[PDB]
């Protein structure tokens, strides 16, 4: 219990909100960043109709793959976005 | 379409080939017709208004004379040259083209509409009298012309009759970019509904 | 005579002309290299100009909306003068103001924006939640020692 | 015909005439025309009868009920579903 | 500031305080502007919302009465968080890992 | 040769460049031997003056008024107009520039060169003086403004509609309350655009990933 | 009288190494995945009332 725990200061990180210029700034960067490796992802999937796995990661990617790439990049904001609201309209009801 | 066409025509006018086909005056003709349907007031000026070539090759013609008329009256923000200048281009170009005898009232009605709507930007309050007057028509024959063009969804203002004031009612702010976006990610979600729903099926 | 002059221009004050001209007219006027010369009536002339020049800071300050009307008894001229008087000191950045000509309005401010309201907000909240935690420390100690 | 106007009118004025209501639910006289709006809740002060009465009055009858946090939907609770879904 | 202390808003209208101090809503302005002079209260002053909202309270020496209003508060406050929370325990009880 | 590339980087926007061939024009009349040179030295001199005056400097503009040959071996009513509108654009006030023009008008027409070069200063000099203006008001009568201006309520406002469409302080205008409204808020926002571009690329992957299996039917 | 101050944990380089090891829970806190932050929101509202 003495090492898990991190004080009264613990749970305090929880409830805190923080600048929007950086909250507004992480959503753009990650929106922009899933169009550039989306067009990797659109010649992927117009291809891949021809046989050999290997051959398929060396022509038109399967080394770093896109699709795979984008979708964590995707997950990971959406969960932001989903604990900042949540965070936000607790504060909102909860202080006042 | 014009769209491509516009962009075709003035290159017609740039590179000097109007061959085996009507003549040069004709091929600059159609470049300002096109040039004034597609392309917004900032890039009017830009590609039409200013061209070496429609400069060079002045209006000798009276079909390049009249659509050159409207364009110039249209930026110089005068508009009671304007009208009587959209009835010389029916008369003398879009009726007696092969291409544009049926877009002949197609552009007449647009023109009426493009000036209003750029007004329309620049004021949030005009009176009727005041704009009706120098559109060179009355307030009767101003209510019925901008009645057709209202529910065309282009200029989107109001008419008062009692106090005789044209607001203008066109967002540009918060409420506009909902308005857009959200259709386009309706249009993903029935692509998605769509071309799941046969591969299950199956 | 020079401690009440100096600290009436210093302090945060809201006042009007003839009642500060009045202190100083008998004053000021036997003492030449001052107020006292010919060409330093235009030195006495400036002083009426100096005393709204930083009532515009105060009134800036405290009142973030504020009538015209109310505004131009305040530095005591017309409407006309006023609003000239208000613009010099929007342009060299000393106030941030928007005048109306019909009389609606002087809203003076600097106009936030969507993002700096947001800012502000996030501040009161975190700053909110170290208060309560040091307040739980400082009840322990209290009844401790009691 | 009297009821169906009375449900549209509600949403067409906030304050009509007498003289003006009276020709809308075609009574031919006065005792016809104050006992329609009295059960309708609006009163009539100066020969003018009042649809804000009705209109503010159904309002609070809304609130008053419990229908509301669902239809509605709280915001904290929108996210909370948001989530689970994620991890489900 | 002692009337706008124990109510639950920060703000005054010109109305109140002409009655307050039973003096014009002339004096109204000249007195809450001294107020944000000495530092008494901060805040913004507007004419023609005719309001001043203040955003501090300068620190006093705390009698009983004050202490009563301080108490209440918290007691609303209270039971806001335990509302809030009820509901979100509930809800995704099963999901959590 | 010298003459003929001035007017061209002239109209190029480029004034002292401009200033750089014209002078040199001048010299060649000047020093050559009269017998119409008189009349060529005189148009270039006006030339001169065009230029340096665009470029809003008055150090320079006084350097070429000298006695010496602008007020001496030349000396026209020309020279004299641009002078005068030379101190005008600079004290910018339009009120100036209007009493100047009235008179000389045949001293700026009879040149083409200073012709589109002037028509374009008066749009210049109604703008400097207006924006400064309106800066720090905000629902500021448009009549108000057309009395320090000094042109009538309406001809402003026909200027004002067209900066307007410009989009150089970007507001709106009503004419029925005669107000004036400025906006400098933002009318896109990033997140509006790169929303747009996103959802956008999707559907053409949902295109393409059935066209990869048309082989399920 | 005695004053409280920041009572923080911060920890050496040193001491990490052995901490971590220790460890085989998944922590009173980490805030890592969605999952640890969804119950820490809960949590933190309990934490305020209590105080």
New interface residues.
Partial sequence: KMLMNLHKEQWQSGLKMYDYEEKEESNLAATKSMVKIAEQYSKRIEEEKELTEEELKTRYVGRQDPKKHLSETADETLENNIVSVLTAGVNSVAIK | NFKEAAKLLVDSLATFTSIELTSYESIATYASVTGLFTLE?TDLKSKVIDSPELLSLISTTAALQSISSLTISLYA?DYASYFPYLLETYANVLIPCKYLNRHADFFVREMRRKVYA??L???????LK?MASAFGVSVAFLDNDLGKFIPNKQLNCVIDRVNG?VE?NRP??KN??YH??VK??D??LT??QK?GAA?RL? | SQESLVKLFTTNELMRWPIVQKTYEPVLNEDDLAFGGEANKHHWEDLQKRVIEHNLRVISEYYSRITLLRLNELLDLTESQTETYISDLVNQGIIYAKVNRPAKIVNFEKPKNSSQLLNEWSHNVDELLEHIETIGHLITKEEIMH | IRDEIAKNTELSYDFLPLSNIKALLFFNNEKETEKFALERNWPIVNSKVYFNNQSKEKADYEDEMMHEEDQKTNIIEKAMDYAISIEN | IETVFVKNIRMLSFEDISKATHLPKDNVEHLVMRAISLGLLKGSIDQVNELVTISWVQPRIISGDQITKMKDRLVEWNDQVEKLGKKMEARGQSIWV | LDLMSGILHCEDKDYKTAFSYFFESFESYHNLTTHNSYEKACQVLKYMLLSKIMLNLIDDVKNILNAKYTKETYQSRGIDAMKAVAEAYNNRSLLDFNTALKQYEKELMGDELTRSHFNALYDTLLESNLCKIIEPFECVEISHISKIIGLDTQQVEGKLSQMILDKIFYGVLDQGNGWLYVYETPNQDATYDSALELVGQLNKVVDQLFEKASVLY | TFLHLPCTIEAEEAEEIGVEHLLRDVRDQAAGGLSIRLTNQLKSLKGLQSK
Wanted: hydrophobic content about 30%.
């Fill in positions: 007031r923000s750029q007004l930007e620049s004021y949030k309050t005009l009176s005041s004031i203008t540009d702010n506009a970019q857009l976006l386009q990610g249009g993903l692509k998605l071309y591969v199956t």
